[PDB]
């Protein structure tokens, strides 16, 4: 079986810091499966970080960046889309279990 937990969070950081996560991902012909529901995912998240306090964890997959779907969007364009918002980031992720 699969347990898919969708969670939508708003990340608010200061100028002198980061969101506190490492985005990893990726070709491009992508078929979302329950195990891999997206391409880009959080490889690590800094404990007590902005992202971390927001609820986000290692393994979460990035579905949306600021209301816009990034399910099939490349790594470059996603990092690029994250920077676009500056200190505010609304992100929609999925935590896949079992």
């Amino acid at each position: 079986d699969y347990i898919i937990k969708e969670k939508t969070v708003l990340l608010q950081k200061k100028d002198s810091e980061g969101f506190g996560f490492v985005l990893r991902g990726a070709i491009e012909e992508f078929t979302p499966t329950p195990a891999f529901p997206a391409l880009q995912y959080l490889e690590s998240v800094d404990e007590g970080g902005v992202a971390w306090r927001a609820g986000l964890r290692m393994g979460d997959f990035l579905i949306e960046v600021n209301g816009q779907n990034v399910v099939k969007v490349g790594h470059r364009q996603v990092v690029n889309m994250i920077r676009q918002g500056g200190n505010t980031l609304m992100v929609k992720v999925v935590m896949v279990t079992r």
Binding site: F21, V22, R24, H75
Partner: peptide
Amino acid sequence: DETNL
């Protein structure tokens, strides 16, 4: 490929 955010 990775990025620190």
